[PDB]
Amino acid sequence: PLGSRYEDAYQYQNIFGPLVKLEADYDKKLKESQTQDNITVRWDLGLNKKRIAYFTLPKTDSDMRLMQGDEICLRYKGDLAPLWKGIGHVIKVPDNYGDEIAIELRSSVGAPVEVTHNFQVDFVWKSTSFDRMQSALKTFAVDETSVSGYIYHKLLGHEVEDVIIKCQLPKRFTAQGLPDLNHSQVYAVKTVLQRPLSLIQGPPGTGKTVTSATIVYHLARQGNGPVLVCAPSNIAVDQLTEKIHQTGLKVVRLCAKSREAIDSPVSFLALHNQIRNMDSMPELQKLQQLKDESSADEKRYRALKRTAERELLMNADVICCTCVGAGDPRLAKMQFRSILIDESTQATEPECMVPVVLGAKQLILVGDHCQLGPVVMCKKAAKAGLSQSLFERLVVLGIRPIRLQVQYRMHPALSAFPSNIFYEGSLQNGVTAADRVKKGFDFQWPQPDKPMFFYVTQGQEEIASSGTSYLNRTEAANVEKITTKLLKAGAKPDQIGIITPYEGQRSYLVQYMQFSGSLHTKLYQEVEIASVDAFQGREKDFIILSCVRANEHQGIGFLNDPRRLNVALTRARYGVIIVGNPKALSKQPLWNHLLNYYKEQKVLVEGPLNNLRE
Site residues, ligand ANP (CB under 6 A): 179-182, 185, 202, 204-210, 368, 371, 408-409, 537
Residue 185: contacted member of ligand ANP, Mg ion, none (CB under 5 to 8 Å, by partner type): ligand ANP
Closer by beta carbon to Mg ion, 209 or else 234: 209
**231-234-236-240 Cα dihedral, nearest 10 degrees:** 80
Residue 210: contacted member of Mg ion, ligand ANP, none (CB under 5 to 8 Å, by partner type): ligand ANP
Residue 368: contacted member of Mg ion, ligand ANP, none (CB under 5 to 8 Å, by partner type): ligand ANP
* Contacts with Mg ion, 199-218, as mask; x by CB under 5 A: ----------x---------
405 annotated ligand-binding residue: no
Residue 205: contacted member of Mg ion, ligand ANP, none (CB under 5 to 8 Å, by partner type): ligand ANP
Q: What is the DSSP string of 125-171?
A: ---HHHHHHHHHHHHHHH-TTSB-SHHHHHHTT-------------S
**Binding piece for Mg ion, criterion CB under 5 A, among 86-94, 142-150, 491-499, 532-540:** 532-540
Residue nearest to Mg ion (CB): 537
Strands 318-322, 251-253: parallel, antiparallel or unpaired by DSSP?
A: parallel
Residue 88: contacted member of Mg ion, ligand ANP, none (CB under 5 to 8 Å, by partner type): none
Closer by beta carbon to ligand ANP, 69 or else 207: 207
Residue 401: contacted member of ligand ANP, Mg ion, none (CB under 5 to 8 Å, by partner type): none
Phi and psi, residue 552, nearest 5°:
-90, -40
CB of 251 to ligand ANP, least distance (A): 17
371 annotated ligand-binding residue: yes
Closer by beta carbon to ligand ANP, 204 or else 226: 204
The one-character DSSP state at 307 is H
Count Cα neighbours of 209 within 13 Å in the Cβ-side half-sphere: 24
207 annotated ligand-binding residue: yes
Q: Which of 86, 504, 537, 582 binds Mg ion (CB under 5 A)?
A: 537
Residue 408: contacted member of Mg ion, ligand ANP, none (CB under 5 to 8 Å, by partner type): ligand ANP
Helix/strand/coil for 449: coil
CB of 528 to Mg ion, least distance (A): 17
- Single out the residue of 126, 75, 123, 72 nearest to residue 102, CA to CA: 72
CB of 535 to Mg ion, least distance (A): 11
490 annotated ligand-binding residue: no
Closer by beta carbon to Mg ion, 412 or else 537: 537
Contacts of 501 (CB under 8 A, 6+ apart): 61, 531, 547, 548, 549, 555, 556, 557, 558, 559
Closer by beta carbon to ligand ANP, 129 or else 209: 209
185 annotated ligand-binding residue: yes
- Single out the residue of 322, 319, 286, 362 nearest to residue 133, CA to CA: 322
**Contact call for residues 301 and 288 (beta carbons, < 8 A):** yes
500 binds Mg ion, rule: CB under 5 A: no
Q: 144: how many CB neighbours lie within 10 A of its CB?
A: 7
Q: What is the DSSP string of 373-440?
A: ------HHHIIIIITS-HHHHHHHHTPPPEE--EE-SS-HHHHHHHHHHHSTT--EESS-TTTTS-TT
Number of residues that make up the chain: 614
Residues tagged in the binding site annotation for ATP: 185, 205-209, 371, 408, 539
Q: Contact residues for Mg ion (CB under 5 A)?
A: 209, 537
